[PDB]
Design a protein around this ligand. Structure first.
Ligand code: CU
Length: 96
């Protein structure tokens, strides 16, 4: 199944809450919509998610319409533009 992160508002600020009440499965797809001149999608670990620090080698997406397939387990995504992560532009999901 495909989920549009943030619904009609897309990938934006103060969105950490979006995952709340959703049940993800391995193989599900997260679709991220945004203006790439102003935002990105970065795949980090739990640590990076918590401190808003991008680990070395983290994958960065910048298409504006990214389709990310979820592996089994935990996945963490942040926007690493200055101050975005700190403003709630991050999500944590668990895929069963
Ligand atoms: Cu951003």
């Amino acid at each position: 199944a495909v989920y549009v992160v943030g619904g009609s508002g897309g990938w934006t600020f103060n969105t950490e809450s979006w995952p709340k009440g959703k049940r993800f499965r391995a193989g599900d797809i997260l679709l991220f919509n945004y203006n790439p001149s102003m935002h990105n999608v970065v795949v980090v670990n739990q640590g990076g998610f918590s401190t808003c620090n991008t680990p070395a080698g983290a994958k960065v997406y910048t298409s504006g319409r990214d389709q990310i397939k979820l592996p089994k387990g935990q996945s963490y995504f942040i926007c690493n533009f200055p101050g975005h992560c700190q403003s709630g532009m991050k999500i944590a999901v668990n895929a069963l």
